[PDB]
Amino acid sequence: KIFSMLEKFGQFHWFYGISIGQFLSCFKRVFIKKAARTRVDEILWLLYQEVYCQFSTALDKKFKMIMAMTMFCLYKFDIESEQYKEAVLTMIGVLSESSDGVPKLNDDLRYLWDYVTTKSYISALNWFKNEFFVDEWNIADVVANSENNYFTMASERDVDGTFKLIELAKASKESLKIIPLGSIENLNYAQEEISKSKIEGGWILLQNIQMSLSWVKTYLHKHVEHEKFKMFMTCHLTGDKLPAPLLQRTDRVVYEDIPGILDTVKDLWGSQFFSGVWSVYCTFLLSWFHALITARTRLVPHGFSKKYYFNDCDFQFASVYLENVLATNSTNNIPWAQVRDHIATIVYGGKIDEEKDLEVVAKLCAHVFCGSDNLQIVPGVRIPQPLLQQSEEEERARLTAILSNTIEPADSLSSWLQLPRESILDYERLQAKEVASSTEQLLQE
Amino acid sequence: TNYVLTLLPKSDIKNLVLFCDEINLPKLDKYGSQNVVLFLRQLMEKQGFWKTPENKWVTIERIHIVGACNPP
Amino acid sequence: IQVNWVEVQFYWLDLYGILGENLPLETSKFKSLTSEYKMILTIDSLKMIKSSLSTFLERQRRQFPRFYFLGNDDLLKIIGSGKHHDQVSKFMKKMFGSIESIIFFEDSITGVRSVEGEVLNLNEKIELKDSIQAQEWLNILDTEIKLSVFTQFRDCLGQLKDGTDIEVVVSKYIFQAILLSAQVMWTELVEKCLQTNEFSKYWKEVDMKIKGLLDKLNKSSDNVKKKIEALLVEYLHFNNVIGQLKNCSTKEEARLLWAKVQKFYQKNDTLDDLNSVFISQSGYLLQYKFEYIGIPERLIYTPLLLVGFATLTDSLHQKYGGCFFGPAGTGKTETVKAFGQNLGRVVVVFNCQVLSRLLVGITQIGAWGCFDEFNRLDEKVLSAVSANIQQIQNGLQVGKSHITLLEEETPLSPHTAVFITLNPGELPENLKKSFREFSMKSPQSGTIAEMILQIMGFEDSKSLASKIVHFLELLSSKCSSMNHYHFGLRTLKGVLRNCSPLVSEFGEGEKTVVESLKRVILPSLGDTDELVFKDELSKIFDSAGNSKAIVQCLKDAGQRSGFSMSEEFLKKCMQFYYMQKTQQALILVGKAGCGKTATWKTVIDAMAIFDGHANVVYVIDTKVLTKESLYGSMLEWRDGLFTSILRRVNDDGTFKNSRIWVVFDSDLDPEYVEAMNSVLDDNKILTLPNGERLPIPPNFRILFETDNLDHTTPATITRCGLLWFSTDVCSISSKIDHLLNKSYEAELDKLKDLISDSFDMASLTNIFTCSNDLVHILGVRTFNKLETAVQLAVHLISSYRQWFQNLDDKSLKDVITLLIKRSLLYALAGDSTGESQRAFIQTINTYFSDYSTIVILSFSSFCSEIPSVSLEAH
Ligand SMILES: Nc1ncnc2c1ncn2[C@@H]1O[C@H](COP(=O)(O)OP(=O)(O)OP(=O)(O)O)[C@@H](O)[C@H]1O
């Protein structure tokens, strides 16, 4: 039954395929790893826990949740009674807006009822992962417990795992070799690097093979036991289809993004180094604006009209424009209206086509780039205007302090983004409805 | 037939009849059209045809067209 | 071996012109093979030598990079004319993009002609000699034309700083120099007004200026007309900018509006010519290349056009490539070309090996190269082209001076920028890592129409523009959206262009707009669409709608040709005549037997009777001749039939005074109309494979006659006029009458009187309606069956006419009725099963035998003449 469900997962998406040998090795891991008044139930429970802990990492968050709660549903179908099944199907139906009913009264079901009547779908749906499964593996546990050397860490857009990969490289005491792909000189450089590292050892990272699927098909399939040699083939979930025999011979790893907004500002500010006081203030304000618009990007059906990707090129363009505006101004009076129009129209509103998203971006720029004395970009923190009798270094210290002073509350997506809470509740309800509909489609067959 | 610019059948008494069996059998081109049936249409409607290697107009006078094709 | 000897002789003379008259292993092998051929296949060895001598050819091609755009054959043909100084200035438009020909006086270069023929006064003459190579004097001409443009810019700036009026300078110097002078004067005056808080004085000054330019436009003939309207577009732009700055409440809003629009500058401290003028848009700085571009049309300065110009300025400030994507018809490539022609560079448009060659040429010359329809490429060539453009771009940001492409050392220019436009219906990852995509919205057609009408001088501009754009929007909303229905900016510009020939006879006002809108939009609609169009034109326009001579000649020609003057036929003929009066490229759309060949033959005969002009008709079908038979292939050279008729109409005295009409009476294949893309537009030049440029007389009107438009690009629908036949132009009795007249032309009066009396319409309509409910194998209309019914009846009567003088009138009437019955049975329902034939007999008998006939004469039967054949076993 579990392999049938994983086969439907494999036929859903090109990156979600599963091999038979992978399943058999994962089942052997159950006996490698060393009670309900017996042994066979212990073996079955350890099978479920081990297959979760191994094949959770090859999915994104939504498929992780649906697979976890489907596995819990099958286990409780086998173990528990008929009224338990009726209660579980009642909650699945009321989560999918299909069948409404009351439980047929196990305090865990009581906490589940208290969670779902409070309209907290995310907690009521992470209840399965928090209760049934006790072990979770990150990327470090995957790379530390895999005999295979070729990894395919395919991360979706706006989510970058290269920083975590190089940080893990320091943690494993190894220097990574980042290789861009796309040009024939870089193709020959990558071929020479892998030819060196396949015999001399050393980790190596291959990135951005999306335009180089042709080279991948012509080389890697023909190319596919050395210590400290683990090559990574970073791909994209929304990109073109990777070759199936390459995917069958490589481990599958999916990365997940940071949920915070303050950490994005901290990362952008740390990545920014230099140039007057007003240039530093404009860079800080623009970093906050970029983090806010990237945070509002992910809320697809409510925050925006469709998915967009504001990469670092737009940040660089806006920073260069702010530098040119502040530099080519001998009066030291910042034209905030002109820079507001240019940011909302040309730099960040360039690829945006429809008018409502353009109005949203213009409203965000008016809220952020107004340049007032009392600038409350978020309710948490207050930003005062810079003075005139100082230098750059104390301003850098003050801005680092004002980042370190603030904290991110749990309602950041409703308070820091100027979005109504009912839209967030409807978004979470729609997500829960979609995942419950897909899991009942999986359960009915 | 013989050439005299008029195309003349060899028989000076009898009208030559051009048999065309299986008119549906020639294939359409890459852009949804046939060619030999258009040539026959030009031959029976404009009463002649244009020569390809000499770029000259040759008329027809007493050659008729018959067909024999299955329903499609 | 005559053809082989001709080929060897041609190879020998071409290689003589390449190297024999000029001054190691390849040359020695050539000299040995030439000596062997003179003493006596060596042509393959000569081709192998030319393949091996391509490296020297590539080096000579890269000596002067303008010659790189052309092909190998054209370049070697240019190089072979190294002493005659011929053919160099004829087909050089491919390397410059806007220069067609060069005039030379006393063996010296003194003038340059634009794409239309604008004569320019060069500052310095160029000496010419037989020892001077093509590349040296080509570089001299390039430097001379740039110097002439700069010194005319200096002269314009001096004469404008002297305080002289502009009506005396608009008629003697080039359009680029007065363009820059007007822009510089405008930005200086508005900046001096921005140092203070007044705008009314120079607003009134530029208002009187545009009034004077409008008067000069009304007094100008052709070239001055184009120049004055080109200047007047940006003069209205200056008036709009100053008026917008007038309504600004604060200083900050005025500064925003002034920084958003383009500003022009020059440096008075530097001394170089080509780098002394820079433009500033939203802070960034771009340098004016000072290149001549001819006199192309100016795009109407929409605010969204300025937004897009700011987008390209932002993209080019950091050496990124601008990218456009959006719905078709928003003017993206036109926006890129407007940016090029405003900043002063020619942009080589790519209609996207050869692409890589054009790419390396445009990145080695430093000019801009734009793209159109980027998504139609095949995957392999798309990947190769994308890799090439991304690697030259990565060379561009890195500051590299040379890049290695296709194993050659090609230098990288410090001014190369490449733009790509998209028509989704996308950009790959490698390109999106280094580009700046922008989404063009729907352009404001109201402002464009208002300004265009202000060039044309109509007394009502804003209300007329709003009315016409709302009317086009309502036609877009309230009509059946078929394939050929376009109601956007292209048709609006076509209507505003077609308003020009009617204003001299109809006068400026609303009625000319209504008449041209009718003559453009109405003949491309159906029947209910025609009713909706008429209702909307009556409702939204005040004008609800002297042609005695042309209608009388049309009626006379139709009556002598046997055709009937039905009201739909008359309407379609008048629409076709009024539509060929202005537009040259026309197509005919309609079902089989709709009356298209008849209507154009009728109007051509009426035109020959009325205007007295001779008419020569060349009927031709597209799909019955192949590609080589229509155009011509290089074996030597053979001329195709279309090129043959162009050759005998150009090279030929009667054809000059005669209107030669050609009709393409077949399906519109995409290949033939793509080969016709160079003549259906305003270029009017055949693009022969060998490079011959055959001229076309203005009376050479192209026609097309095609039933299905599913395999034709929408660009051809916009470029060429479309005539639609939604309904048949004939009554049925018209078909019988014309067929009877033609058959009589092909007791005779009594016979034709009885034939005409045998046809009565009241019962014929009912029997045709009843027969239309029958099943026809390979079903065709009864309108297409009378064609053989009438001919069969007339032939039977003409065959039996020999014994039609010794019988009574009742017997003759019985013979007439039997023969008409036989023809109607065999043609109207002569394609169905015998049971349905018996049903047809019963229906036609109850509305008025199966094998009844006349046997030589008596009413005998077929049963008395069948022979019982005697057959043997074998
Ligand atoms: N009063 C009439 N007006 C027009 N055509 C008439 C009239 N009476 C008879 N006809 C016949 O109708 C025919 C109409 O031909 P039409 O121009 O519609 O050709 P078509 O079937 O579209 O041709 P093609 O398929 O070759 O493009 C004429 O050739 C003529 O013989």
Ligand SMILES: Nc1ncnc2c1ncn2[C@@H]1O[C@H](COP(=O)(O)OP(=O)(O)O)[C@@H](O)[C@H]1O
């Ligand atoms: N700002 C403008 N002012 C005047 N005309 C314009 C403007 N923008 C577009 N047009 C007109 O719109 C027409 C359609 O442009 P089109 O060729 O469809 O561009 P693309 O091929 O890039 O989509 C052009 O002929 C052009 O004359």
